[PDB]
Design a protein around this ligand. Structure first.
Ligand code: ZN
Length: 33
């Protein structure tokens, strides 16, 4: 295929996080609204 690894995309600013745990932490930062 394209050999593109699907990472953990943020749904607020749309960035690819490496870990789900880190994404959860990020979701707090991006959820400060
Ligand atoms: Zn974000």
């Amino acid at each position: 295929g394209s050999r593109l690894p699907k990472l953990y995309l943020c749904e607020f600013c749309l960035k690819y996080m490496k870990s789900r745990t880190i994404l959860q932490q990020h979701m707090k930062k991006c959820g400060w609204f």
